[PDB]
Amino acid sequence: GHMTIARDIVLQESVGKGRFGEVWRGKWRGEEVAVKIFSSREERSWFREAEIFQTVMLRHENILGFIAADNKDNGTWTQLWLVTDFHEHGNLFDYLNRYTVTVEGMIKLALSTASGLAHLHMEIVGTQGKPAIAHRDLKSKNILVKKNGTCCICDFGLAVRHDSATDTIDIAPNHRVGTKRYMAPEVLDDSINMKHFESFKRADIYAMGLVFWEIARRCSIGGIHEDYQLPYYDLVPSDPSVEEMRKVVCEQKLRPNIPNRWQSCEALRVMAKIMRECWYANGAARLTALRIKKTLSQLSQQEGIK
């Protein structure tokens, strides 16, 4: 047939894991594809991520390209597959550990992440309407770097969708899901109002601010940059508990430190200001993803990027 299906894909190499499922590099008609495999007992996680990926009008240059949700029976058990575009550079966490970026590179990565999130967060009204979506697990490990230097967001297993007319969320979400290190203050202290969709959007913003801090450290100007670090590397253990995170973020009220050299460059000054404005303990005070996109677009034009 013309459509991509599991039976026509050959797995070649293990390339990591998501929250649920294992990721493999596959081959479909000579072309590289990413394949996320789930067992029968993980049917709900598989189904939920396939459901998010198939949302009407979701496709966007800054959202991971969905190919197919399929089943493959090997004759003993059935694997549940989620097929997507393959990106050679892998995730932003891996890329930032391997490389430093230029001012252009940094702005390209930050702007494309902000454009992807604003598309996700924004409702598109009309006959082929797209509901507003909150990611709930944004981190550098869930952002993939494309060959052209732009980003796309992936891993939608925890995402929530909003029905604006009836003001309802498509699933009943559980407290403190996601990556503990990137959890917003209101998530860590359980004060988040989970019956208000805007709360999930604001929590994604906080996490995006942390990712921007990760990028900016790697922005090398005149061969000077910081080494790669995860946010809160200087304050919490490698695998921090919610209690360790809450004591730092909510009680001591600390945020990742803004290095003095970021004050000496306009692009880094703009990035530093966006970060602070993502990091308020109160979500209603944080910038929106659309405002961040607008700010970074203006900065991209000023520096003549791409």
Curated annotation (Swiss-Prot):
Active-site feature positions: D137
The keyword Kinase belongs to this UniProt entry's keyword annotation: yes
Any single GO CC term annotated in Swiss-Prot or TrEMBL for this entry: receptor complex
Membrane topology designation: Single-pass type I membrane protein
Entry comment on modification after translation: Phosphorylated at basal levels in the absence of ligand. Activated upon phosphorylation by TGFBR2, mainly in the GS domain. Phosphorylation in the GS domain abrogates FKBP1A-binding. N-Glycosylated.
Enzyme category, top tier: transferase
Catalyzed reactions: L-threonyl-[receptor-protein] + ATP = O-phospho-L-threonyl-[receptor-protein] + ADP + H(+); L-seryl-[receptor-protein] + ATP = O-phospho-L-seryl-[receptor-protein] + ADP + H(+)
Complex formation: Homodimer; in the endoplasmic reticulum but also at the cell membrane. Heterohexamer; TGFB1, TGFB2 and TGFB3 homodimeric ligands assemble a functional receptor composed of two TGFBR1 and TGFBR2 heterodimers to form a ligand-receptor heterohexamer. The respective affinity of TGBRB1 and TGFBR2 for the ligands may modulate the kinetics of assembly of the receptor and may explain the different biological activities of TGFB1, TGFB2 and TGFB3.
Record protein name field: TGF-beta receptor type-1
Organism: Homo sapiens
Gene this chain is encoded by: TGFBR1
